């Protein structure tokens with residue numbers, strides 16, 4: 001809706017912008033509201049030291065009649081020299097703030113008291129704090145000279161590239177940027193392009209793109225936009241709820257630039273920005289939180305009003321963007337504290353509602369047509385006796401059974417959040433384990449054996465006539481942490497870091513590289529699809545169990561150069577380790593698998609008990625956590641009346657005229673014994689197709 005032509009005719013005559021009376025103009029426009037003919041004539045001949053006029057400031061609002069505010073400050077002096085205009089605009093926008101009152105700034109993180117609100121990521125999805133800042137000694141963005149914009153870049157980059165620790169990173173200037181860098185920054189949502197029709201008419205687009213640039217730390221949790229709408233747009237953000245950490249990281253960086261360079265700042269306005277809407281703190285603090293039940297709640301609006309925050313909706317059903325509505329009259333510390341307390345109060349509403357509905361027996365389980373293992377063993381008696389206990393990591397019975405409740409068509413419907421779940425909720429888990437893993441009894445206990453030399457497997461089909469492929473997978477979880485459904489944000493990131501650290505140290509047969517899912521370009525994605533190495537987000541069963549939290553943060557893929565060794569990280573289990581080969585050499589596949597699994601084990605360790613073997617969030621993956629597969633062509637021995645008599649002696653099953661043959665048992669036998677059985681069974685099947 002930009003009409004630059006019409007405005008230019010009024011600007012060149014230094015005449016009152018008549019378009020501000022054209023019915024299409026925004027009724028709520030502040031420049032329309034407060035730029036009266038008497039204001040205009042009183043100021044139309046005034047100019048700042050930098051040459052900024054009244055028309056320069058108001059121009060964007062006349063070009064873009066749909067403007068909410070409609071004015072931009074060319075410099076600091078513009079706020080005072082055109083005071084009769086800016087004051088009325090500021091006190092309208094920032095109501096009930098009064099310029100006479102004064103503003104107080106506070107960038108000391110220690111003043112904020114904010115223990116991590118939602119480490120388990122049950123409700124809060126992401127946290128983001130933005131500040132706008134302008135350097136001492138220069139004009140603001142609409143009025144900065146060509147040389148000054150460059151000098152600002154030079155000084156800012158000098159400070160930013162000296163940043164240490166988690167703030168260390170790289171600067172990417174827009175001028176000279178190549179296509180690969182441009183795409184990387186687009187994929188990370190870090191890029192900004194030429195200003196819209198609002199920045200254009202404000203004169204902010206001058207000399208594009210000279211002096212513009214992007215800085216970001218290696219973690220990609222800190223972002224700086226240089227010379228966009230203001231000199232500095234500084235952003236601290238991350239998934240999860242730790243706003244205390246976010247504000248701490250922001251202030252460490254901001255105060256460093258402050259001490260070395262200095263910001264434009266007054267008592268009246270706080271920190272000076274191009275648009276008056278960004279005065280004071282220059283801050284936008286935001287949190288994304290799934291809060292469906294609290295919205296319905298009668299005290300919802302009162303909490304927002306109390307803490308001066310607002311809620312806007314944006315997969316993300318029930319998810320709201322909570323953010324501050326004030327920038328003047330409160331400090332940065334105060335803005336974050338209201339933000340913290342406000343979210344906390346909102347989260348407590350959502351928690352109360354969920355607690356109430358989780359207080360009673362899942363009535364939906366009373367339907368006789370629900371044939372899940374959950375319904376079979378979860379009597380109201382058992383439910384009542386367990387419903388109020390929680391593990392050391394905050395896992396409850398309802399957390400464990402939630403997927404089976406939400407998904408009535410589950411076969412099992414029960415997941416474990418941590419190791420303690422298998423003991424604390426043993427009345428439920430024991431019966432489910434022994435049912436699915438029948439005839440195994442927990443008292444028998446389980447023996448793990450990852451010694452490949454204890455397997456006697458001379459190659460069956462070296463010709464490659466019958467057995468096309470052989471594949472052995474094991475599911476594993478890293479010791480010292482919760483299981484996948486109960487992982488906190490920092491646990492999942494720790495698991496990725498340490499596992500990646502181990503896999504990179506692998507040599508010989510197992511040397512390879514790691515592809516994280518976060519920030520993966522389309523080229524890598526495609527070539528992983530070709531090899532069938534790429535995994536996607538979990539289904540509705542895993543979603544309801546809490547497995548898909550913060551996707552895809554902390555998820556990644558590793559494979560060796562020979563395409564014979566694959567590791568999925570933080571998918572369904574923390575570690576899904578697969579050995580693959582062409583042909584029939586099971587002993588070679590298992591040997592390679594053992595070499596890698598044993599090394600990861602020594603350096604990191606696995607979650608393991610005598611009664612369950614290796615622990616998984618999914619009770620189906622206990623014991624060996626192993627699926628051994630043989631893709632074999634058997635048209636004839638599939639018919640010999642000794643198929644059952646062999647497929648049952650060696651506990652194997654057949655599907656897939658090529659047939660996939662897999663082990664049926666995971667619990668009660670060792671990995672060695674399981675592999676040996678698959679061998680012994682396929683051998684006799686091959687002693688019939690021979």
Ligand SMILES: NC(=[NH2+])NCCC[C@H](N)C(=O)O
Nearest residue numbers: 448601605606607608609610
């Ligand atoms: N590969 C392993 N991490 N094995 C662990 C064996 C001991 C285990 N902590 C248990 O008592 O059951």
